[PDB]
Every structure is written in C-alpha cells, then in structure tokens.
C-alpha cells in the first residue's frame, strides 16, 4: 500500500523510434510520447526496456520507479513515469540529445577520430569554461543527492547525460549497462564494482559514504579534463586497486588548471573525514566556471 504515486503511462502514447543503446539487461529506445504532459501534444523521450520480467526484477523496478520519482532535481534527468500495461516493462525519461557524458567528452577530444558537430556546441576541444560548467552541474546533482543522504555507488561520466545547450544531469544509478565494460571489476559472480572510481575505504573495508562519492567525483573531474579517458588506463584492474590502496594519485591532466587539480586532490584525501564537503567542491567549481582561470600548454 503506502508509497509514492508513480505516474503510469499508456502504451498507446509511447511510440518506439529506434535503439539508442543496450545495457543493464535493458535496451534504451528513442520514442515519441503523446500527451505525456499538456505543454507538448507529441514529444521525444528516452525509454529503458527490461530484458527480464521475473518477480524479483519487477521488485527492482518498483523500488527504482519509486526512488526515481522522489529524486527530482535540476541536474538529474527528468523521470516521467513507467509503463507496466504490456511487457517489456518501460521507464520513461526526458531525451538528452548528446547521449552519455563520457562519449560526448571523447567526441570533443583532441584525440577524437572524426569531428562531431551539433548546433548547440562547437566541434573540437571544449572551452575550459564549459569543461567547468559540466563539472559544476554534476556537482550540483551530487549536492542534492547528499542532501537526502543518498549514495550513488557508481559516479562516472558514463552514468551522466548531456542535453540541449550542454545541460549535464545524472542519468543512471543501479543496474550497470555494459556487462563487458572495462571500468568494472568482476569480484564475485553477478557482482561488479567500478574499482577505478572507488576510494580505499571502499576497496578495503567495502564501505560507501557521501565521502566515497566525493572521492568518485574527483575521478569524474579527471575524466572530464581528459575528454573521457579511463582512469589508470595503462594499468590492470588489480594494478589500479594496488595504486588506489598504496595511495598513488591520478596525474594532472594537460588540459587541467592547477586550481581544479587542487579541487581533485581534496576529493582524494586518504582520510574520508578530511575530504572536502561536496557543497564546497560545487561552490568552487561554480565560482571557477563563472571566471575561468587562464592556462596554456
Ligand atoms: C543508452 C545509453 C545512452 N542514453 C541516451 O543517449 C539517452 C538520451 N536521453 N536519455 C535519457 C535516459 C537515458 N538515456 C538517454 N537512460 C539510460 C539508461 C542512460 C543513462 C546514462 F546516464 C547514460 C547512458 C544511458 O543509456
């Protein structure tokens, strides 16, 4: 009985257009939703399918739907509601035209193998003030979630989305999409963690706290200032564990001013208690975004 009213959607108002992608045993479609909300009579959305419909996965779904319904913020991808009328079970979010932040970073790389346009952003390397803008918006999401003592255990550019005008929001939480993803380390069976993003207290004592998140967010900045590079890409899953645990730190990115590296280094304090409040990290990134310091070669 007692719970959050989750907006349910008729299958007739949902027209699947094509696969955007496929992960977490749940394909993601572009689709058109008719009369979802009165402002637009027909409107574009992303939709998460479910590959399995077992009663211990329909439970996963109701929790996710409930939790998603409450977690409403500027920098968290709008959730419109679900659809259980037919089968496969559907979840419906706003469409983010630039897809996941990690791809988007790699495609505004210098290393980028081809040029990617769009009407709302220059091709080629992004303005430091934009890089910071991105960071700033992820930090605004993280702050909200810390607000509700929510802990995202997989903070990474891969789990963020980029929309019209370079709006950046948090887009995924649980149920890791790519099962053959190289960022995740297989520890049991059906148990994989994004080691490279994880702080020592998490690899060692398997403890995850808003501080663990802050740590993880420092790596997100690193990813953001490397146009989506995999942290410790030269190393192996065990080598990275060694590095993190020994206390080795990620090098400064070439593109990365020392004022930001500084922020990163305060996210990576070995003492969880000695890591900067996310709120303070957000503040400084917002400030820096407002007046981007100059920095060459
Ligand atoms: C299929 C990929 C790409 N998604 C979209 O391009 C895409 C565009 N808009 N949008 C909305 C939700 C959504 N994907 C998209 N959810 C999925 C599960 C998702 C979330 C992420 F944080 C990152 C990637 C991702 O799915």
Structure tokens at 34: 């008719």
Cβ–Cβ < 8 Å for 152, 173: yes
Question: What distance in Å separates the CA atoms of residue 213 and residue 221, rounded to the nearest whole number?
Answer: 12
Contacts of 37 (CB under 8 A, 6+ apart): 43, 80
139 lines ligand 1 (CB under 6 A): no
CA 205 to centroid of chain Cα atoms: 24
Structure tokens at 42: 């027909």
Tell me, what CATH number does 68's domain have?
3.30.200.20
For residue 2, being part of any structural domain is answered with no
Backbone angles phi, psi at 45, to 5 degrees: -150, 160
Question: What distance in Å separates the CA atoms of residue 108 and residue 37, rounded to the nearest whole number?
Answer: 34
Question: What distance in Å separates the CA atoms of residue 189 and residue 155, rounded to the nearest whole number?
Answer: 22
Question: What distance in Å separates the CA atoms of residue 220 and residue 170, rounded to the nearest whole number?
Answer: 12
For residue 196, being part of any structural domain is answered with yes
For this PDB entry, the determination method is X-ray
Q: Which residue puts its alpha carbon closest to atom 8 of ligand 1? A: 96
Task: Check whether residue 68 and residue 105 sit in a common domain.
Answer: no
Task: Check whether residue 105 and residue 213 sit in a common domain.
Answer: yes
Structure tokens at 98: 């630039």
96 lines ligand 1 (CB under 6 A): yes
Tally DSSP H helices, then E strands, for the chain: 8, 9
In terms of DSSP H, where are the helices of 2-123?
55-70, 101-107
Question: What distance in Å separates the CA atoms of residue 28 and residue 230, rounded to the nearest whole number?
Answer: 23
Of 79, 93, 129, give the one whose Cα is nearest residue 260: 129
Burial 211-244 (b: 16+ CB within 10 A, else e): bbbbbbbbbbbbbbbbbbbbbbeeeebeebbebb
Backbone angles phi, psi at 95, to 5 degrees: -80, 125
Question: What distance in Å separates the CA atoms of residue 231 and residue 289, rounded to the nearest whole number?
Answer: 23
Q: Beta-carbon neighbour count of residue 10 at 10 Å? A: 12
Query: What are the distances in angstroms from CA 1 to CA 55, 58, 65, 71?
Result: 17, 16, 15, 20
The three-state secondary structure class of 274 is helix
Structure tokens at 88: 């496969």
The three-state secondary structure class of 192 is strand
Last residue in a domain, options 33, 65, 94: 94
Measured over the CA atoms of residue 73, residue 78, residue 83 and residue 84, the dihedral's sign is: negative
Question: What distance in Å separates the CA atoms of residue 294 and residue 289, rounded to the nearest whole number?
Answer: 12
Structure tokens at 114: 């081809």
Of 237, 247, 241, 243, give the one whose Cα is nearest residue 271: 247
Query: What are the distances in angstroms from CA 166 to CA 115, 126, 127, 274?
Result: 17, 11, 12, 32
Task: Check whether residue 218 and residue 261 sit in a common domain.
Answer: yes
Backbone angles phi, psi at 17, to 5 degrees: -95, -55
Locate the DSSP E strands across 118-250.
160-163, 167-170, 185-186, 192-193
Question: What distance in Å separates the CA atoms of residue 19 and residue 46, rounded to the nearest whole number?
Answer: 10
Measured over the CA atoms of residue 162, residue 163, residue 168 and residue 172, the dihedral's sign is: negative
Candidate of 27, 32, 43, 96 to mutate for ligand 1, largest count of ligand atoms within 8 Å of Cβ: 96
Structure tokens at 61: 């779904």
160 lines ligand 1 (CB under 6 A): yes
Tell the residue number behind the tokens 């960022």, with chain if given.
Answer: 183
Structural domain count of the chain: 2
Task: Check whether residue 74 and residue 210 sit in a common domain.
Answer: no
Last residue in a domain, options 94, 122, 148: 94
In terms of DSSP H, where are the helices of 111-199?
128-147
With the CA atoms of 53, 55, 61 and 64 taken in that order, what torsion angle do they form, in degrees rounded to the nearest 10? -150
Catalytic residues: 154
Task: Check whether residue 156 and residue 89 sit in a common domain.
Answer: no
* Structural domain harbouring 276: 101-288
The three-state secondary structure class of 27 is strand
For residue 215, being part of any structural domain is answered with yes
Contacts of 103 (CB under 8 A, 6+ apart): 228
The data reach a resolution, in angstroms, of 2.9
Structure tokens at 157: 């550019």
Backbone angles phi, psi at 33, to 5 degrees: -115, 120
Question: What distance in Å separates the CA atoms of residue 34 and residue 44, rounded to the nearest whole number?
Answer: 9
141 lines ligand 1 (CB under 6 A): no
Cβ–Cβ < 8 Å for 57, 50: yes
Query: What are the distances in angstroms from CA 95 to CA 8, 20, 79, 99?
Result: 18, 10, 10, 9
Q: Beta-carbon neighbour count of residue 249 at 10 Å? A: 14
Last residue in a domain, options 77, 94, 111: 94
């Amino acid at each position: 009985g007692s719970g959050i009213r989750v907006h349910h959607i008729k299958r007739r108002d949902i027209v699947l257009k094509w696969e955007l992608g496929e992960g977490a045993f749940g394909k993601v479609f572009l689709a058109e939703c008719h009369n979802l909300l009165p402002e637009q009579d027909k409107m574009l959305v992303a939709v998460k399918a479910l590959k399995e419909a077992s009663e211990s996965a329909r439970q996963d779904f109701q929790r996710e739907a409930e939790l998603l319904t409450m977690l409403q913020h500027q920098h968290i991808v709008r959730f419109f509601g679900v659809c259980t009328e037919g089968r496969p079970l559907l979840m419906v979010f706003e469409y983010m035209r630039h897809g996941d932040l990690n791809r988007f970073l790699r495609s505004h790389g210098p290393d980028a193998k081809l040029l990617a346009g769009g009407e709302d952003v220059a091709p080629g390397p992004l303005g430091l003030g934009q890089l910071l803008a991105v960071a700033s918006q992820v930090a605004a999401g993280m702050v909200y979630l810390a607000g509700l003592h929510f802990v995202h255990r997989d903070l990474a550019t891969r789990n963020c989305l980029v929309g019209q005008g370079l709006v950046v929001k948090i887009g995924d939480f649980g149920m890791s999409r790519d099962i053959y993803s190289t960022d995740y380390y297989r520890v049991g069976g059906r148990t994989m963690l994004p080691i490279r993003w994880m702080p020592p207290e998490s690899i060692l004592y398997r403890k995850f706290t808003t501080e663990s998140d802050v740590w993880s967010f420092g790596v997100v900045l690193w990813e953001i200032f490397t146009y989506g590079k995999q942290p410790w890409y030269q190393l192996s899953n065990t080598e990275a564990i060694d590095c993190i645990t020994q206390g080795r730190e990620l090098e400064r990115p070439r593109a990365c001013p020392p004022e930001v590296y500084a922020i990163m280094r305060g996210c990576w304090q070995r003492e969880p208690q000695q890591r900067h409040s996310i709120k303070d990290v957000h503040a400084r990134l917002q400030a820096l975004a407002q007046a981007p310091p100059v920095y060459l070669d």
